[PDB]
From a paper:
PLLs are natural lactonases endowed with promiscuous phosphotriesterase activity. The catalytic center contained two metal cations coordinated by four histidines, an aspartic acid and a carboxylated lysine residue. A structural analysis of SsoPox, a hyperthermostable counterpart of the PLL family from Sulfolobus solfataricus, has revealed that loop 7 is shorter in SsoPox than in PTEs; linking the active site to the loop 8, which forms a hydrophobic channel that accommodates AHLs aliphatic chain. Indeed, W263 is located at the start of loop 8, involved in the dimer interface of the enzyme and positions the lactone cycle of the substrate onto the bi-metallic catalytic center.
A single mutation of W263 can significantly increase the paraoxonase activity of the enzyme (by 23-fold with the W263F substitution), the oxo-lactonase activity (by 148-fold with the W263T substitution) and the activity toward the poor AHL substrate (3-oxo-C12 AHL; by 55-fold (W263V)). However, whereas detergent-induced flexibility has no effect on the lactonase activity, we isolated variants of W263 that exhibit increased lactonase activities (W263T/V/I). These variants exhibit dramatic improvement of their oxo-lactonase catalytic efficiencies (148-fold for variant W263T), while the activity for the best AHL substrate is compromised (3-oxo-C10 AHL; for the wild-type enzyme). Conversely, the LacSV group dramatically increases oxo-lactonase activity and 3-oxo-C12 AHLase activities, while the phosphotriesterase activity is mildly modulated and 3-oxo-C10 AHLase is decreased. The residues selected in the LacSV group (T, V, I) are overall smaller than those selected in the PteSV group (F, L, M) with the exception of isoleucine (I). Mutations W263V-T therefore yield enlarged active site cavities for the lactone variants. On the contrary, the paraoxonase activity of LacSV variants exhibit a behavior that is similar to that of the wild-type enzyme, i.e., the activity keeps increasing with temperature (or remains higher than ambient temperature activity for W236T around its Tm). The analysis of the normalized B-factors of the variants clearly reveal that the substitution W263 is destabilizing (as confirmed by the Tm of the variants), but also that the active site loops of PteSV are significantly more disordered than those of LacSV. PteSV lose their activity before the loss of the global structure (Tm), whereas LacSV do not, and exhibit a similar thermophilicity profile to that of the wild-type enzyme.
Numbering used by the authors:
A (entry chain A), B (entry chain C): 1 to 314
The structure:
Amino acid sequence: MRIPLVGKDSIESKDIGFTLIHEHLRVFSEAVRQQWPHLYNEDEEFRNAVNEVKRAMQFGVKTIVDPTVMGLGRDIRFMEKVVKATGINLVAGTGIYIYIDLPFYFLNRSIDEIADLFIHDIKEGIQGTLNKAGFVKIAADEPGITKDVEKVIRAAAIANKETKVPIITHSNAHNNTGLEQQRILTEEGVDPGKILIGHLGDTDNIDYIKKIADKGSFIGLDRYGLDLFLPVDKRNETTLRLIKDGYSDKIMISHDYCCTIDTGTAKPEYKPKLAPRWSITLIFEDTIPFLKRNGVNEEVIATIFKENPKKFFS
Amino acid sequence: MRIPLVGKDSIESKDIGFTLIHEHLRVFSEAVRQQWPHLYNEDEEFRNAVNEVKRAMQFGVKTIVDPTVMGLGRDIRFMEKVVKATGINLVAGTGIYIYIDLPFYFLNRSIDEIADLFIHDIKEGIQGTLNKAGFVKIAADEPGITKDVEKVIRAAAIANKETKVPIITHSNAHNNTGLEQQRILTEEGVDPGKILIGHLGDTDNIDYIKKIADKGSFIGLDRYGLDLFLPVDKRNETTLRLIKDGYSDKIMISHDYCCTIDTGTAKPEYKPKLAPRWSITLIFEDTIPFLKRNGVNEEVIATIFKENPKKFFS
Ligand SMILES: [Co+2]
Ligand SMILES: [Co+2]
Ligand SMILES: [Fe+2]
Ligand SMILES: [Fe+2]
């Protein structure tokens, strides 16, 4: 068809339905898990992922896009297990998630070689399977657009131009990285509308957010529940304001929820302080009803959660 | 019952025999291999490692110490297959190899949590097996002693003090990282004689090398064949000079040869320029004959390749 799914036949973008554009079934550091497997519990990770996905589906979520890629512990077989246990439509991606430097493997390797990896996942399959990547994921954060970060961005541009899969980004809302990602990508020939600039919901600086959307890309209001970056109420007020200003055409909403994540920052003790209501269904419980009670009609909701993901992937 | 061996009963340090203190059966980026297995060929890797190890054994090598750890693709089960096929004494280690930052797992984790990983590997076993780590490996390079690099150094100190295993380091011979490693370690109570400061052979700066050796630590003239760092002839001249000045009892010699390595810098085309004679037996073809033809008697050879590793591991 058009959009590849984990453990399923590919579907036309018109079949994507209600979508969570940015959620993680499981995140871990590849090298740590490989070296110290005693730190991880696959049974628990699987239960958590399945339980979260099931609840998401009980609210009418049809499709989840999971931008777990190199550096976040992408595991296609785990994803496949989750799909088999839930029946969710799952879009897996390819890409590289780094903030500073690429792994030593890439020393003296070209941007083209990097893009070749993305294209391989897109055209042939991920990690030895026939499950194909439906988008490319790239990142930048506090360190900004380092040289390796830039190489990855340009490789993503090459992959998009070859295969037409969209590009999802991770960015830091406070240091211009999102705008810079969009700039490099569009200069490399990437259609602005094939890019989702991520984590813009971490700021209430609406002029910045509008600037990215106005240049043609989707804007990721995609960390609902992560109060340590920005509280739910402030995200809500920002979201509502953008909608009132007519930006529904570019808005994408999600939680960036990790059903399991191995970082020290996570960990139960900090959750009450850092992300008390963080989960894969918070927007159904809080955000969406908030918007409706403030005059946002169902047609806008559908644009955000059905139409935008549809355009993104077509 | 003193030095743990992969796939073998432990041996008394005095039985270690002729030792290559720093060689790699295989090196790769964990994240890259997990994400793009199509880039690797385990058959080739296995055959290369076996062929190299048994040629080293024909030259009388009894023990190989392999400091492949997290970040370099440590794989205890691959190491076991190689031991089974060769009968070599192989010492595996634990540790973390980074130049800048730790994997995201370590965000908000203490130096003690890191040290616990090392101790686990030393006391319990590596990657779910009963093969135990016989030393700790740490690293620093161009970027210098970063905050995360220093945490790993301090974690290694804790591991050594708890378990008594020695510490092998990776350094950049031109920026003082080696001296710093020694400083921090010793300041944390590590016996300087339980430290090997690596890659000092990369420079002909005899004074720097001597200062480290004078402070009580072993010095790694350990990249023989890697011309891109320093040609064989200049290495030999430094080595001979050092021995001439009475540093035999601090010198350790190796190739840091990677029977297979995935980095772009490696790779066929660049070999004839970067490392034409690089292999696990270059010192038997070149270095050792050069030393012996220049006044180095068999006692000094035995000291570097048998006594020093013995002391290091006891
Ligand atoms: Co992100
Ligand atoms: Co090294
Ligand atoms: Fe994410
Ligand atoms: Fe090495």
